[PDB]
Design a protein around this nucleic acid. Structure first.
Lengths: 50, 99, 36, 49, 145, 84, 89, 156
RNA sequence: UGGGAGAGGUA
């Protein structure tokens, strides 16, 4: 909210990134990555890898 | 938790068929109470009593009385008698042989 | 937990009302805003 | 472990003790099953007393 | 210590008159910089729901508050959040609980580095408000009399 | 007849087949009979004196300014003087 | 008056069939709406019965399939709001 | 004894290790799928406890294994203080509950009795101070003598 | 994560 916007300019942020759901390899599977294809949606800003 | 409400991976829900059959029985019973309070005509209240009988009989044994009540994906729903009785019933799939 | 017999019989409406804990009076299962 | 109960307005008949042959309601009341089904389907009246 | 009851309501009323004065944006920006970087995060077309004081008395209140509260920006930010913008104490305490770093706690955590609860956050913003009013009050009498 | 039918909507269509459709003029007569019954029940509840005292005291309750002016009157400074 | 326009109820509920509800539930709730239209009908506006009864029957059928058709029930104001945002965006 | 910033650093690492050990016990409360949906839509005001990266957890577990294996009572007090999250007063009262009457020779003429809460709090505090003092230097040496694995490199 | 269908395959 704009109340929290002015107080954000006062104080700052928090972490708020506790739960981690990163993609991991299933057990037993190995081998070299050969292709990474990053599709996105029209509207979301991309990153350096994209 | 014996007629559970399990989700999917894309946010949509995939409930059991018992919740659908219980929803049918509760809706037609509530409509029968509303029709008995509203002083409905004899034809309408008789059809609603017949619908409640059909819904209760479907919940107890779907494929028994008449045409089996099919779900949304054109397949007949699993009642209590279909949960217990059959090749994929409670007895021969979980009580005798367990994982 | 140490029972000698499993007796089956018909169920009176008084016995079914003795099993239960509250009359279910609404078809809707849970909410949609918060899932209580 | 906890059950509920639905309070039915009109008392309906159990389908097991009506359709699993022998019907047990036709065998108790000594009425034919077709006539009992006609009574339950609200097609024909029956007289009690 | 703290103030008495009549001095608390007198200073509270004068600060909300002063807060209604600065909330219009009539404070000259060269006079101070902390209110200048506080008032940039709000729209220019604000509404007026509070009674507004006149010019030079609000000028006197603004010059005395940035002469006594020029050493710290956090307590002054709490003061402008409570009186100038008009936000309540509970919202300020809730945002301070949702932001502040883990601190050492006595008599309830045993020295465990943990986040502060909401109750101690309400208590510390009340203590900050009461300490800022105690720094405001006698210098404000020195400016008035 | 009443045979081996099991679809309840087919039996509903049989039990609704006994009545006939309504013509251009007949439903005005049925609605006139409905309004005649409403007028008869109103003109028989009209002359009951305790019902008249009930409507006057509910008008004292709405004129004492704690109830709204919508849950007791629908239509016909005017209702006030005629109830006076 | 009620048991002479049940064919109107089956004519309205013929189109709402495969919307998540059984065909017999639709005409039953249409009969409820037909009773509510009979009780509040005024004959002095020249219209016969059907132009007044069709709105109430359609309302009862729509309010039946908007509530008793899904487990996760969405209210009718929220589903038209998300439908309006879906049609604009 | 130790100083305060050393105690702060050691207590932070041991609290992380305690929350890592407490994330592996057998008996835990069960929450159904409806409770998970409620927690995912509107969670609690307080979040969970932070864990180690499982290598720091294994290394601190090996350090306390090397130091506190000869003393079962002090290691149990350390586990119930840092993993279970119970305070020192709760551990002292639970020690007062199962306390056995020991022969004391300090106050009075050597009477037999059950020890009170004050001596229980004192021995719990002394055990915790001595345990942290014994853990700290070998934990500092083990964090010092560990090879920092860097990011992957590109050879052509 | 868990449930239900349809198709294919192995013994």
């Amino acid at each position: 909210t704009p109340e929290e916007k002015l107080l954000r300019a006062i104080f700052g942020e928090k972490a708020s990134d506790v739960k981690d759901s990163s993609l991991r390899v299933p057990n037993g599977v190995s081998g070299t990555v050969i292709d990474v294809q990053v599709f996105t949606r029209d509207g979301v800003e991309k990153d350096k890898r994209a | 938790d014996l007629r559970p409400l399990v989700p999917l991976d894309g946010g949509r829900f995939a409930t059991s068929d018992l919740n659908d059959l219980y929803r049918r029985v509760i809706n037609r019973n509530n409509r029968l109470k509303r029709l008995l309070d509203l002083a409905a005509p004899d034809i309408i209240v008789r059809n609603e009593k017949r619908m409640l009988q059909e819904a209760v009989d479907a919940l107890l044994d779907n494929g028994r009385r008449g045409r089996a009540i099919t779900g949304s994906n054109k397949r007949p729903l699993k009642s209590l008698a279909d949960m217990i009785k059959g090749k994929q019933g409670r007895f021969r799939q979980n009580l005798l042989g367990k994982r | 937990e140490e029972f000698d017999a499993i007796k089956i019989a018909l169920a009176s409406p008084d016995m079914i009302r003795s099993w239960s804990f509250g009359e279910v009076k609404k078809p809707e299962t849970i909410n949609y805003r918060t899932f209580k | 472990e906890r059950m509920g109960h639905i309070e039915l307005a009109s008392p309906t008949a159990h389908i097991w003790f009506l359709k699993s042959l022998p019907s047990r309601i036709g065998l108790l009341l000594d009425m034919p099953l077709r006539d009992i089904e006609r009574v339950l389907y609200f097609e024909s009246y029956v007289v009690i007393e | 210590l703290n103030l008495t009851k009549e001095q608390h309501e007198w200073l509270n009323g004068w600060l909300e008159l002063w807060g209604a004065w600065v909330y219009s944006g009539r404070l000259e920006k060269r006079m101070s910089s902390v209110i200048a970087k506080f008032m940039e995060s709000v729209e220019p077309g604000r509404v007026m729901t509070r009674p507004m004081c006149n010019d030079d008395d609000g000028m006197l209140i603004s010059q005395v508050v940035d002469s006594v509260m020029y050493i710290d920006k956090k307590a002054f930010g709490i003061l402008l959040s409570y009186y100038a913008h008009g936000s309540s104490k509970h919202a300020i305490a809730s945002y301070y609980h949702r932001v502040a770093r883990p601190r050492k706690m006595l008599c309830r955590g045993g020295g465990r580095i943990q986040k502060p609860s909401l109750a101690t956050c309400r208590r510390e913003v009340d203590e900050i408000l009461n300490a800022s009013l105690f720094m405001i009050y006698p210098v404000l009498d020195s400016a008035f009399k | 007849e009443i045979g081996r039918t099991t679809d309840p909507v087919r039996m509903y269509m049989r039990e609704m087949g006994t009545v006939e459709l309504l013509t251009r003029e007949g439903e005005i007569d049925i609605a006139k009979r409905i309004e005649d019954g409403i007028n008869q029940v109103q003109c028989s509840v009209a002359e009951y004196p305790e019902a008249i005292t009930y409507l006057l005291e509910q008008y004292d309750r709405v004129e004492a300014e704690e109830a709204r002016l919508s849950d007791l009157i629908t239509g016909f400074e005017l209702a006030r003087e005629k109830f006076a | 008056m009620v048991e002479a326009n049940l064919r109107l109820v089956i004519s309205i509920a013929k189109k709402y069939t495969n919307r998540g509800l059984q065909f017999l539930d639709l005409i039953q709730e249409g009969n409820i709406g037909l009773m509510k239209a009979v009780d509040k009908f005024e004959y002095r506006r020249g219209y016969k019965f059907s132009t007044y009864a069709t709105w109430w029957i359609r309302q009862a059928i729509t309010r039946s399939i908007a509530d008793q058709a899904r487990t996760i029930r969405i209210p009718v104001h929220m589903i038209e709001t998300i439908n309006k945002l879906n049609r604009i965006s």
